[PDB]
Amino acid sequence: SKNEWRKSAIANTLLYLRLKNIYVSADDFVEEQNVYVLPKNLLKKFIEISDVKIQVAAFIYGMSAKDHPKVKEIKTVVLVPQLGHVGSVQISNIPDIGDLPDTEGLELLGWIHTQTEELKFMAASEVATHSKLFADKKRDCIDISIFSTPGSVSLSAYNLTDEGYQWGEENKDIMNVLSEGFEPTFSTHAQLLLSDRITGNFIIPSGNVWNYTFMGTAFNQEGDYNFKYGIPLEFYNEMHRPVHFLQF
Template structure:
């Protein structure tokens, strides 16, 4: 079994690999000795108006070293350079067999709950198909808000019935 990489979903397409991805990918490589830095990539999946853009990156040796030691999670950490990564060719095909490793809880999209995602979070993984990007499991607060709206409307109807009685 060989890890090919990981996918980062993002709302906008960036012209380069984000520094947070360089740091995260470096730490994944350093913690998993069986991962080959020349073959293990990061794919950014950007949701642009009317489409979805995919870009693949691999780290350069300098990027790997910088990312392992970087502690700054801000948008412009010191020492970050565009030479820390290279864009790589990506071939989309139905001829390759593989599988996804997804978190045990099945939540992989933190776009709607970003404050809950940290690089140090602990989770187990299992083989499975990822839920859709907009699946309700990724948007629990949206559905909680909908149910709260229903409760208010039911309460309003009850008070209106009492006025008419």
């Protein structure tokens, strides 16, 4: 089919229904270990703008609590310019949000994304793109994998260890002929707790648009962009799709 986008664009309308059933996939809680808190308000909007078919990701920023520094409260997210695929995604560099206010103390905690599949470990593409950029900047960054399957969604947070960084770094090119060396043991289950008390917000691109699946011809994966506070757009928002309107 040539008009793939239509079905999906109609389909992902009801993503808010998939939020009527959410699973907090958390294992044994350890007091000594650090723990991440996720705002519900971010999950709401981040999901209801995503897609049933194409993968989408964003960066997460937060900071230590006062009463216990080991508790990492995610405070905000960043939708960078990207070009998604099914199961995989081409996202850009770490945001340059030094310009914006309240950016003093906003610690990059990792990233968060939809999952077309339903695994219990970081995927080779995930380990790859995670190892890219994050490896030689901060190995303490985490990966929040969200099962976006129809009917209901599920959140699972993972912490990539040296094996995936080394394997990913050695994998200088996402070779379709490799897919070897990675193992379910590369990732540590990081406790992720969902909270509706804490509230978070979005940092969007200056030009509003963040999805370049229709603007891919001009998409620069490796470039610097200026950002701003605001409210995100849907994956198949009319601004993401200039092409279709001018085709008359």
